[PDB]
Design a protein around this ligand. Structure first.
Ligand SMILES: [Zn+2]
Length: 302
């Protein structure tokens, strides 16, 4: 009974960990070990934001953090000058049982024609998080913007650059070169918006949700630490949706408890067979070899 299986390179035979620790990097192996321990055991913390370029890892903002970022609004009132362009028709909200500077909403055109409420992109100006949450509940896509000087500009990259219902898309604060909002006119399709096109139209390098864990693997032959950076292949659970779904995180809780069950000794632990790759690092004056799991998924059990 193996807990994980290989999704590729199955022709490979198993290599014991004693051999791997003695060898060079980079190389790839097939192993079969037991999960002695894992970090972080707080699985709410294992979900991070990853940039495919700078390779940074940052935490996912809590609703409290997102509250403070949005509550500030910006440095000025929404410039009435920047309304009803050749890109969006605008409606200004009030402070009338509503809060903020002045909540302005800009419905980007479907190239001349306004959309309905079912497939429309919204630019909201100086809105609190609660106002953004209600509007993202009614419309498909929402972007937090702010009045700059010559054009609307994104609020801040610490806030999501695109909100589609309950999914929050973030960008890299160091690899991105923010373009002003008018560049959204270069979008081909103006009825459906995916984050890749929106981010590039705005010069944003989109972050990716990832599980980040360090498995301590032991086959009795030796002990090895393997990194897991995964979207949705390993656990077969989307990391972009696990942080907000009580069942998703529970079934991930249950997979870790299956690999490394508390109160149980290592004999009853199930075998994890994985495909790992080694790579070099200049860890101090010496030389470390780190290991990462690839092409490995959990076996058939929910
Ligand atoms: Zn980056």
């Amino acid at each position: 009974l193996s807990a994980t299986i290989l999704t590729d390179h199955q022709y490979l035979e198993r290599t014991p960990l004693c051999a791997i620790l003695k060898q060079k990097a980079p190389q790839q192996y097939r192993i079969r070990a037991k999960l002695r321990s894992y970090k972080p055991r707080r699985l709410f913390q294992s979900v991070k934001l990853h940039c495919p370029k700078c390779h940074l890892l940052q935490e996912v903002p809590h609703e409290g953090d997102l509250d403070i970022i949005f509550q500030d609004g910006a440095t000025k009132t929404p410039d009435v000058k920047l309304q009803n362009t050749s890109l969006y028709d605008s409606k200004i909200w009030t402070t009338k049982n509503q809060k903020g500077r002045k909540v302005a909403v800009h419905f980007v055109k479907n190239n001349g024609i306004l959309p309905l409420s079912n497939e429309c992109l919204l630019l909201i100006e100086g809105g609190t998080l609660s106002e953004i949450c209600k509007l993202s509940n009614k419309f498909n896509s929402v972007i937090p913007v702010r009045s700059g000087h010559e054009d609307l500009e994104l609020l801040d990259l610490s806030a999501p650059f695109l909100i589609q219902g309950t999914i929050h898309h973030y960008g890299c604060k160091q690899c991105s070169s923010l373009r002003s909002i008018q560049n959204l006119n270069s979008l081909v399709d103006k009825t459906s918006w995916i984050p890749s096109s929106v981010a590039e139209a705005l010069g944003i390098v989109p972050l990716q949700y990832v599980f980040v864990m360090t498995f301590t693997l032991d086959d009795g032959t030796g002990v090895l630490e393997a990194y897991l950076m995964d979207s949705d292949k390993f656990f077969q659970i989307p990391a972009s949706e696990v942080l907000m779904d009580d069942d998703l995180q529970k079934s991930v809780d249950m997979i870790m408890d299956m690999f490394c069950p508390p109160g149980i000794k290592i004999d009853a632990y199930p075998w994890l067979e994985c495909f790992i790759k080694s790579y070099n690092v200049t860890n101090g004056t010496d030389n470390q070899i780190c290991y990462q799991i690839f092409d490995t998924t959990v076996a058939e059990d929910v």
